[PDB]
Amino acid sequence: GSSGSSGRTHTGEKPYACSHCDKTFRQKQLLDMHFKRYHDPNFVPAAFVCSKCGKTFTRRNTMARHADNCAGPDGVEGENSGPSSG
Ligand SMILES: [Zn+2]
Ligand SMILES: [Zn+2]
C-alpha cells in the first residue's frame, strides 16, 4: 500500500520522545502540544461533543453551529477497542 495509503495501517515507533517525561509521539506537533499542555497548564485542548448526535468538535463555536444543522445520530455508533502491545 505504497504511494496510496499511509497512516491507516502502519505502526511506526514514535521517533519523538519527550525529554521531560517518558512519553512518545509520531508527529512533533503531538510532542509539541503535549509539553505546553501537561508540563504547562497554559495549552488547553478544545473538547466539545455534540448533544443531538454525539459527535466530536475541536471548536466551541464550530460545534454550536453544527448542532443547528445537526439532525441527529441517525444510527448506533461509538464503540471500538484495540487491546494490543505494539
Ligand atoms: Zn513530556
Ligand atoms: Zn450533532
From Swiss-Prot:
Ubiquitous. Absent in primary spermatocytes. A zinc finger (C2H2-type) spans 16-39, 48-70. It is found in: Nucleus, Nucleoplasm; Chromosome; Chromosome, Centromere. More than 13'00 CTCF-binding sites in potential insulators were identified in the human genome. The 11 zinc fingers are highly conserved among vertebrates, exhibiting almost identical amino acid sequences. Different subsets or combination of individual zinc fingers gives the ability to CTCF to recognize multiple DNA target sites. Belongs to the CTCF zinc-finger protein family. Chromatin binding factor that binds to DNA sequence specific sites and regulates the 3D structure of chromatin. Binds together strands of DNA, thus forming chromatin loops, and anchors DNA to cellular structures, such as the nuclear lamina. Defines the boundaries between active and heterochromatic DNA via binding to chromatin insulators, thereby preventing interaction between promoter and nearby enhancers and silencers. Plays a critical role in the epigenetic regulation. Participates in the allele-specific gene expression at the imprinted IGF2/H19 gene locus. Interacts with CHD8. Interacts with LLPH. Interacts with CENPE. Interacts with BRD2; promoting BRD2 recruitment to chromatin. It is linked to Intellectual developmental disorder, autosomal dominant 21: A disorder characterized by significantly below average general intellectual functioning associated with impairments in adaptive behavior and manifested during the developmental period. Additional MRD21 features include short stature, microcephaly, and developmental delay. This is Transcriptional repressor CTCF. It comes from Homo sapiens (Human). The lineage of its organism: Eukaryota, Metazoa, Chordata, Craniata, Vertebrata. The gene is CTCF. The chain holds residues 515 to 587 of 727 of the full protein.
